[PDB]
Amino acid sequence: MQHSAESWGTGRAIARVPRVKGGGTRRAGQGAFANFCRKGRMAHPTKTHRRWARKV
Amino acid sequence: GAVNYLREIHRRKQSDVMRYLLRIRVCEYRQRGECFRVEKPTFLERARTLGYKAKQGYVLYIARVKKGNMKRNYHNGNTRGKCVNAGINQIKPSLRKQASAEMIAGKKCSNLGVLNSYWVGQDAAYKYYEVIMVDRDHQAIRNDPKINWICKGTMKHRECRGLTSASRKSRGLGKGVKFNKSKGGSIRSCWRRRNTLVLQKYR
Amino acid sequence: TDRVKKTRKLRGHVSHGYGRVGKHRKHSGGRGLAGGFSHMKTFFTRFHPDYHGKRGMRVYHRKENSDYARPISSARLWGMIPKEQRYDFLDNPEKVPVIDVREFGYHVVVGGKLSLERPIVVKARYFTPSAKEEITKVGGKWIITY
Amino acid sequence: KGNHALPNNHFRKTSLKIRIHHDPETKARVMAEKKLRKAKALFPMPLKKLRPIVRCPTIKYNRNERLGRGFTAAECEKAGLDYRHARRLGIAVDLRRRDTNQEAFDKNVERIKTYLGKITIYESVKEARESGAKPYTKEIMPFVKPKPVVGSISREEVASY
Amino acid sequence: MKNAYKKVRVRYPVKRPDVKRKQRGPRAETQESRFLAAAVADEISGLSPLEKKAISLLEAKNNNKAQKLLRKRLGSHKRAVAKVEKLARMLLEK
RNA sequence: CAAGGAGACGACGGCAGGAUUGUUUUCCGAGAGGGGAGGAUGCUGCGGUCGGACCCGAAAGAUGGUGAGCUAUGUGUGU
RNA sequence: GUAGUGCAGCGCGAAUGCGGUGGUGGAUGCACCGAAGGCUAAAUAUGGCUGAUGACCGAUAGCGGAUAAGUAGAGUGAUU
RNA sequence: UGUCUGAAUUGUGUGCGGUGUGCACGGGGACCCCUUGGACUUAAGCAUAUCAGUAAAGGGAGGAGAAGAAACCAAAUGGGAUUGCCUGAGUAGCGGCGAGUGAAAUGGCAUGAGCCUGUGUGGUAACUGCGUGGCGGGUUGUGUUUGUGGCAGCAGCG
């Protein structure tokens, strides 16, 4: 999630996922943030406050 | 005692003698500038009850403050939000004007430390206050254990953090059930504890 | 064992149990309890008809430690004697127990029949009229204590 | 939808925070080493102070006793002592409390005399080391309350036991 | 407490002891130095304008008009009665 | 064509199945007044609510900063 | 905080066997306390650094970054 | 040891002296204290309300900070400084009495500790910053001895 990505909207003949800003590098214009994009985040990230122990 | 007689006189502000001395000395202050030095105390016995001594390393300054409501600067009153937040003209400041005067005198002498302050007069446009300050680098101060506490590191710029008597007055501290919103030490640390959820490992 | 999980059997079936025509959307109907006087009025009528409106006097700061008055029934009053001293009383049928409910956490005495035909002494705050009849009917007597 | 109790779960603030200590077994035993290290830095003196017996306030807790904060200046004086000198002997003094009961005043005077007979005075840490004095981390003479017992009379139940 | 419980109520007998309590207020062995300092202050200083205008209402006889002028300008009622008691005794002495 | 890719997790309540133990219960009423009647603590699953809340998607709103090397107008000095 | 729970501007402005408080505005009993000067360990919070651990990931995963990575490159610039 | 720079200063403000000699400024800012202060969002619309005195911005500190020794809580046979956790309790209450919002005392634990001053002699300031038996301050009021000794501990190196 370390980008300022934004979607381009419709009207350009490509799908609606948000995309990296800039120029001059192959990262520019690729998908970001989504769980199905290369280098994205997990749909439901794992958290530290799940229950690890149980009571007998 | 000698201090009993001076106390009874200074309490009767506005009685035929104090009304003469107030007009004569406030005419002096109006000819000096925004913040200036005085050599002896104006009200000698009120200054000694607030902590002043006749010793090297004690200093007195007088400062004025401008007397009214606080300012909000939007071009023609546009505040860029909802109508409950669009008031311009009758908003009152959060601190007292006696604490605003300490911030003026504490920047002018950045090498000293503020101790207390008190009222000394008034105008149509200004009020005047008398600030007591101490030299944290003099050996006369660093050597005696009645004022020595102010020379350590948590004691720098007490009047910027709300630790003098005038600025303490606005924090909302006290005893009993009429002061529930400051338990823990201040308003913000009461907020934080009550906006936290604590869980045990075994739950 | 114990029914593993619904998601494990839904893999492969489109729509995951929520229907094709009506779907699984965001908040269709409003958040929390919205609509309570308009389109959810049938909900409150059928299940929670006493929820809205005011009803009563409103005491600021009720004081609960000073109003504690926990009751107990005359019908027990004998199983309240601790386990050690109980057999001492049932074997010698010529001694009378003196029981003070206040030392076990009770304040008021109400209730029914005394469970045995022997006298006793009972101290408390406030016996009710029916408790007074059933303690006197066996030959015991009641006392008001602190 | 459905017949359920109306829910009141408060998670509408993004500023909320969660807090969990994930290893309370190592945290307890790190605090017991701190507690045994103070005890042998105060070595001869036992790290806890003698406290009085008091009574819980309202009508709900009326019949229960408890350890309190400190003794009063009159309780210390009648036990043969000055409150400036009781504080050098490991006794806690509270000058806010007031004296209004004569039975409770007497239990607390005898609690002091019992404690004054179980302490030994020396002149140096060397002597106490050589006499077998050890460090103490517990509390001095804890209060425990007794069980409820049932009285017993015999057929004299008109003189109102 | 419920009203039925307050009727049959029984308290514990306590046996109160005997020991002196605190002082609570201006001490009785310093009136001489407090009375002297206040008698020097009224000779030195004059009178406030509010006390001038209130002894002229007591001057005629108007103990009521003076009573409402002092209650409006001192924000209390217990205080305005204690002040028209001092300003009446300073006339008898005067 | 290959690989990655979406009802998992927390809090509070209910019910079902299961484990251990069982000498369990502060009631009615706005009040004033009146007055005896098997659960508790864990474990797994499902339905409900608030949490980013099954995954991806607006036109907008606010706080704090950058630009007159393109272009527009005024003014100093040249061609 | 319900008829100030607390704070501030402007104006008025106290007392000395006296002053303050008791979840509804005011009165009066009884109860309980002494403001408007100063300092004070311990038990509590937490980026990063260093030690010790783990039913964690195994090169499209894991930090953006297992390599001369905030580098090569892009933008007048803030930035990316 | 550290070229030339950078707060970057041969400066600006200010204390003590009377021309000597000090101090402040910038960096960082997770956590802490003070100031200022939104809108998205929820109410299936929306204006009080909510999000929230939260984000962003600014000023000032430390290994923690802030708080703190009753002008308290209460209504018993009374408790007794501050700070943290469980219960009390999603309760008393606030609220287009709508959506929502929301304490505390008592009881049980952890840790426990209390002090300094503005009215100090008059048979003589009994006081101290600088200096080696003196100068400066001070009666509009100063009042400040002492640890290569002991006791307990913590880390590192070979």
What is the residue-wise DSSP string for B22-51? HHHHHHHHTTS-SEEEESS-SSHHHHHHTT
Question: Which pairing describes strands D65-67 and C96-100: parallel, antiparallel, or unpaired?
Answer: unpaired
DSSP code, position B150: G
Question: Which pairing describes strands D17-19 and C121-124: parallel, antiparallel, or unpaired?
Answer: unpaired
Report how far residue D99's alpha carbon sits from residue E19's, in angstroms, rounded to the nearest whole number. 8
Amino acid identity, residue B72?
R
Nearest partner of A3 among A26, A27, A24, judged by Cα? A27
Which residues of chain E lie closer than 8 angstroms to D105, CB-CB? 17
Nearest CA to the C1' of H90 belongs to which residue?
D8
Which helix (H) or strand (E) covers residue B88, if one does?
Answer: none
Contacts of B196 (CB under 8 A, 6+ apart): D16, D17, D18, D19
Nearest partner of B43 among B66, B21, B20, judged by Cα? B21
Residues paired with residue C142 on neighbouring β-strands, in sequence order? C122
- Would you call A48 an interface residue with chain D, using a CB distance cutoff of 8 Å? yes
Q: Which nucleotide is nearest to E37 (CA to C1')?
A: G16
B171 touches B186 (CB < 8 A): yes
DSSP code, position C144: E
Residue D37 to residues D32, D44, D124: CA-CA distances in angstroms? 9, 13, 20
Distance C45 CA to F50 C1' (A): 24
Report how far residue B164's alpha carbon sits from residue C126's, in angstroms, rounded to the nearest whole number. 58
DSSP code, position D54: E
Contacts of D160 (CB under 8 A, 6+ apart): C141, C143
> How many other C-beta atoms can be found within 10 angstroms of the C-beta atom of residue D89?
15
How is C66-135 classified by DSSP, letter by letter? Answer: GG---EEETTTSSTTS-HHHHHHHHH-TT-EEEEEGGGTT--EEE-S--SSSS--EEEES-B-HHHHHHH
* 3-class state of residue E14 by DSSP: coil
Report how far residue A11's alpha carbon sits from residue C40's, in angstroms, rounded to the nearest whole number. 41
| Helices and strands, counts by H and E, chain E | 6, 0
Amino acid identity, residue B89?
N
Chain H positions within 7 A of any protein Cβ atom are 13-17, 22-25, 32-39, 42-44, 47-55, 59-63, 65-68, 70-86, 88, 90-94, 97-108, 110-119, 128-130, 136-144, 151-154
Q: Which nucleotide is nearest to C15 (CA to C1')?
A: F54
- Would you call C65 an interface residue with chain E, using a CB distance cutoff of 8 Å? no
> Which of A47, A48, A51 is the best substitution to test chain B (most B C-beta atoms within 10 A)?
A51
Q: CB distance A52–B201 less than 8 Å? A: yes
Report how far residue B32's alpha carbon sits from residue B64's, in angstroms, rounded to the nearest whole number. 10
| Nearest-10 crossing angle of helices E31-44, B2-11 | 50
Report how far residue D111's alpha carbon sits from residue D141's, in angstroms, rounded to the nearest whole number. 9
Nearest CA to the C1' of H25 belongs to which residue?
B110
Please give the torsion angle defined by the CA atoms of residues B41, B43, B44 and B45, in that order, rounded to the nearest 10 degrees: -150
> Which of D9, D11, D60, D62 is the best substitution to test chain C (most C C-beta atoms within 10 A)?
D60
Residue D43 to residues C6, C115, D128: CA-CA distances in angstroms? 65, 61, 9
Report how far residue C82's alpha carbon sits from residue D37's, in angstroms, rounded to the nearest whole number. 45
Burial of B163 (0-12, 13-18, 19+ CB in 10 A): middle
Nearest partner of D90 among D42, D131, D126, D54, judged by Cα? D42
D91's tokens = 């006794």
CA-angle at C109, arms to C103 and C114, nearest 5°: 100
- Would you call A52 an interface residue with chain B, using a CB distance cutoff of 8 Å? yes
CB of E81 within 7 Å of some strand G atom? no
Resolution, angstroms, 1 dp:
2.7
Q: CB distance C126–E4 less than 8 Å? A: yes
Phi, psi (5° rounding) for residue C67? -115, 15
Instruction: Give the residue on D whose Cα is nearest the Cα of B201.
Output: D22
Chain G positions within 7 A of any protein Cβ atom are 1-2, 5-19, 23-24, 27, 32-34, 36-40, 45-46, 60-65, 70, 72-75, 79-80
B66's tokens = 């401008």
C94 touches D149 (CB < 8 A): no
Distance A22 CA to G69 C1' (A): 18
Q: CB distance B15–E37 less than 8 Å? A: no
Report how far residue B64's alpha carbon sits from residue B33's, in angstroms, rounded to the nearest whole number. 9
Experimental method: cryo-EM
- Would you call D15 an interface residue with chain B, using a CB distance cutoff of 8 Å? yes
Chains A vs C: touching, with 3+ CB pairs under 8 Å? no
| Nearest-10 crossing angle of helices E78-93, E65-73 | 130
Amino acid identity, residue D131?
S
C133's tokens = 């009849």
Residue D78 to residues B47, B142, C30, D108: CA-CA distances in angstroms? 45, 45, 74, 10
Question: Which pairing describes strands C71-73 and C108-110: parallel, antiparallel, or unpaired?
Answer: parallel
How far is CA B8 from its chain centroid? 25
Q: CB distance D102–E19 less than 8 Å? A: no
Report how far residue D63's alpha carbon sits from residue C123's, in angstroms, rounded to the nearest whole number. 14
Q: CB distance B201–D24 less than 8 Å? A: yes
Report how far residue B117's alpha carbon sits from residue B131's, in angstroms, rounded to the nearest whole number. 4
- Matching residue, tokens 């050599």: B39
